[PDB]
Amino acid sequence: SLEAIVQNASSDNQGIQLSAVQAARKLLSSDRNPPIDDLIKSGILPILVHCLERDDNPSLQFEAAWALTNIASGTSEQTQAVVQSNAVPLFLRLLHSPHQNVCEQAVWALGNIIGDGPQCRDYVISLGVVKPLLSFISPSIPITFLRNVTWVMVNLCRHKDPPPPMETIQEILPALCVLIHHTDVNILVDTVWALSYLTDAGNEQIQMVIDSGIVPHLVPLLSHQEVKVQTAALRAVGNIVTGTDEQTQVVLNCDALSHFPALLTHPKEKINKEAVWFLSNITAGNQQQVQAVIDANLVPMIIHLLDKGDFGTQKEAAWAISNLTISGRKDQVAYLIQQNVIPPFCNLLTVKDAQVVQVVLDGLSNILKMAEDEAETIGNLIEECGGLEKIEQLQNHENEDIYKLAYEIIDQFF
């Protein structure tokens, strides 16, 4: 029973002690909702902690870290207890054990601890987990081990507020540059998702990704055979193009747009939404980058999703037509109109997402403000396609930001 296990774990006889921690591990690895609460209150934690120090007994160290790993895999209150029992420095000491079964289970325990919070992340980092962890990446390492290493490397990147230190980011990227060429499916997915979080932190870390030189190996993953790899890559590269125009160009300089005809027509709508969301930020840059969306024959595919796509895809598509409207030249907006952008763009005012309504009308505002002579020409298109009637009825007080816009547009051109 429980009380006997917590007692037999203190024996001086290794035989009874080991066979007692083996029982403490199974009770934590016998289902998916283990009795972890009753295990913490059972006082087993300090005995499991001290077992980590028995360099003379490796099999005791393995079973001890396994038990502590699964307790850390629970809630934050469950994970705090493992770190509150002074087990983190002993795990780090085990990273250099001459028994690979002990090195691996110590890595596994640290990842769950790192994943709980940025405080617990910076704690294990300050002690120096990155340098020995990345020392495991080698030819002779098994694949099941490397998968655990890459996953801890994800949590080392996972949180952005506060973001991980630069010293650690500068140490991880030269390993991602090595792990991005792996053949295993799960390793590559984790190697790209870590890039997604590093590109999600901020522009200061996006340049670290750029300066590392890994983007030329990240863009071709937009056409990888596995959808799991593109989804992370589409998110990873999708964040890079959210900073400065000089950083977005590095993405386009890797022929990023030549991978999107297979994404704008993908059957999965999540990819479609994630694809147009990328092109939206591209339409926010300078005119040369806006022209790159035009020189790739992507605008008709954006408009098609703007017409027949889903709500989440149309929201990012209306954004894509908007950022281009207030940034590009007159012929680029004129190119939009001759591509029959007028009918579907106005058919999104009836949505209850005020953000989209503001987006289209502002884009509807900047269109009419750019074609100075073709005001009557374009106005007939909006009136014939049924937009003006929807423009007229948008003068309601349920949002002054919309009311003010839908009136000035009418007062100047209608």
Binding site: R25, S29, W66, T79, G111, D116, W151, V189, D190, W193
Partner: peptide, 14 residues
């Protein structure tokens, strides 16, 4: 949709 997990258990068989 397959975001990598935050925490992980190691299941036994045995």
């Amino acid at each position: 949709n397959y975001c990598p997990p935050v925490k992980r258990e190691r299941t036994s068989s045995l």
